[model samples]
Target chain A: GSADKSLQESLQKTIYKLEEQLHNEMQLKDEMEQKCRTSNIKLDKIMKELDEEGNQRRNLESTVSQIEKEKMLLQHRINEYQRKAEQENEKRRNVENEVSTLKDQLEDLKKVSQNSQLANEKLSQLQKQLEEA
Target chain B: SADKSLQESLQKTIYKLEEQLHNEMQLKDEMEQKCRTSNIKLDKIMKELDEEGNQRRNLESTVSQIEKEKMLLQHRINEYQRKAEQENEKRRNVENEVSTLKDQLEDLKKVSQNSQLANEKLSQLQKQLEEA
Candidate 1:
């Protein structure tokens, strides 16, 4: 009777130790499941963020190309304006050169006309002298 | 004997749970790394876009200023050309006056030629004109 009781007590002690280990494992499983769920939620949110990033990158690329093209066109237009202005200024200067030369010619002609008037006066004086003689 | 059998089965389940937890931890590390890399890419793109925005604004300002300067040059050139037209008209008047003076000189030369009775006096007038 004494030997049988000792064997039963040993069996009960072994069962108690196994139950404690099973409880600890289940607790760890619960914690790990919660951590995995948290990780999945973060993953889902980051997936959306990555998609948004991709969309924004493509849009920025499109915008940059359009802006560059517009800037290039504006530069070309400015160059044309500068070239045309230079041509107009050249034309204006040419006209000015001709005008000043014309003015000098007019002044020379006026002096010649004045000398012709003086010649007429001298010829009249000589004619009077001839009549008096 | 039944109690010993139950203990063996419980140990197997516990080992399986530990293995599942280990796999979950690995998955979590992989997810975290992915998030970090994605965020880094976003930051880089945003900075690039900001710089591009600044460049576009600067170019627009430069372009507008040049346009204004070109317009001013156009106005000044036009004014000079109009002034030239006025001068050209005045030059024509001077040309006509000079032509009239040329005809008057021809008339005076004819009078000098007709003066045979006053030929000596005409010679004096010719000398004065030669000096003129």
Candidate 2:
């Protein structure tokens, strides 16, 4: 025979031990597979969320740009309106001053425009002077 | 032994299974690395986006406040301008009346001077007639 009975038996035992190890390894591999699959799914979801956030940032930036334009225009409008208001106020003051001046002149004219008369030179005195001449 | 070839084959199978297990562990580790690092990146993006949101909101709020100011200023300006126009109208009317009064005073002065001379001459004539 090729080997003794004991040698063959020992080889069978070693093979049995290895087969058990392979089975355990298979179970561990399956567990690892499940974990990896779930992890990959989580990874995909995380990446998807990142992309969505990136899109949101871009969208927000676009809105910010438009708002910036609006703000600039509004500021310019405010400046123009402020200048206009100031000009109008200036005009109002000038008008009030002019009205005051005109009103004063009107009062003065009214006072000067009234009729005046000289008193009748005591007529008898004039007649007596003529008789003496 | 069960044959030298059988033992050889068993050893080979053991080696292959071990490699598969090792590869599986490597895959798990790589997946964890990807998940961990990507999660950290996502956090960074989220934080930055949050800051951006705050900035945008602040700008919007300021715009709204400025809009109110614009309307208030416009109303005030319009009211003041209306006052100015009213004052201008009053000023013109008063100026016109002043001019008319001045013209009337000139005409009255002219008539009063002529009447004074005529009355003096007539009084002299009456004195002569009475003396004669």
Candidate 1 lDDT over A1-133, as tens digits, reads 5555565566556556656655676676577667556656755665565556555555655665665565566556556655655665565566556556655655665566567657767877776676556
In terms of lDDT, the best-performing candidate is 2
| Candidate 2: tens digits of C-alpha lDDT, residues A14-66 | 66776677678668667766766666666666666666666666666676666
Q: CA lDDT of each candidate?
A: 0.60, 0.63
Number of the top-ranking candidate, with DockQ as the measure:
2
TM-score of each: 0.44, 0.52
Residue-wise C-alpha lDDT for candidate 2, range B5-116, written one tens digit per residue: 6666766666776676667668667766866666666666666666666665675666667666666666666665565566556656656665666666566667667766
In candidate 1, which residue pairs get closer than 3 Å at backbone N, Cα or C atoms, i.e. clash? none
User: For model 2, which pairs clash?
Assistant: none
Total residue pair clashes for candidate 2:
0
Error of 2 at A127 (Å): 4.9
Q: Which 10 successive residues of model 2 chain A have the least lDDT summed?
A: A112-121
Kindly provide the TM-score of model 1 when superposed on the true structure, using C-alpha atoms.
0.44
Give the per-residue Cα lDDT of candidate 2 at B75: 66
